[PDB]
Design a protein around this ligand. Structure first.
Ligand SMILES: COP(=O)(OC)c1cnc(N[C@H]2[C@H]3CC[C@H](CC3)[C@@H]2C(=O)O)nc1-c1c[nH]c2ncc(F)cc12
Length: 155
């Protein structure tokens, strides 16, 4: 019922997903055969320096409420969460850029080396402050009115 990904312990708290094979095309026109998970699911991500709740749908991050102890702790959490989403956005953030050995792990290893194109192409939004949380910009700078799409930073 538990698994591990990118140094974070994932534990599904709700929802279901079925598997289906899909051929995607990274930003560098490289073909990858990923197993796409269909359905809405919620997860706990537990790490040594960061924790998060992650709601996702089929190839879409619905929301990520993350807390951490520093900027790189939140950055690692967000990187893992966005690679886990399986979003076409993230697949296309492979820019430049071939990846050498799981496709999902290839993407994580790639985006762990640097998430600039990743963050920079994810998308930003206005926060309504209805959760009393803080937003995070593509550069990991805090903000009180804007945040990367679906990402919220708690304490
Ligand atoms: C019962 O299996 P699960 O469906 O539910 C817990 C489930 C299991 N293992 C895993 N393990 C995976 C994850 C991610 C990549 C590897 C590293 C950890 C590993 C693998 O794919 O082989 N993932 C899920 C899973 C549920 N939803 C998902 N959405 C997207 C997604 F990339 C995965 C998943």
């Amino acid at each position: 019922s538990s698994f591990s990904f990118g140094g974070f312990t994932f534990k599904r708290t709700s929802g279901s997903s079925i598997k289906r094979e899909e051929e995607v095309l990274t930003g560098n026109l490289q073909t990858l055969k990923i197993r796409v998970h269909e359905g809405y699911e919620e997860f706990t991500m537990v790490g040594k320096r960061a924790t998060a709740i992650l709601r996702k749908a089929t190839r879409r991050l619905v929301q990520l409420i993350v807390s951490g102890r520093d900027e790189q702790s939140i950055a690692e959490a967000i990187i893992v969460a966005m690679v886990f989403s399986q979003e076409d956005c993230m697949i296309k953030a492979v820019r430049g850029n071939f990846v050498n050995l799981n496709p999902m792990h290839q993407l994580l290893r790639h985006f762990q080396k640097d998430a600039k194109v990743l963050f920079q192409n994810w998308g930003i939004e206005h926060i309504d402050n209805v959760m009393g949380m803080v937003g995070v910009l593509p550069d990991m700078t805090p903000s009180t009115e804007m945040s990367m799409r679906g990402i919220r930073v708690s304490k």
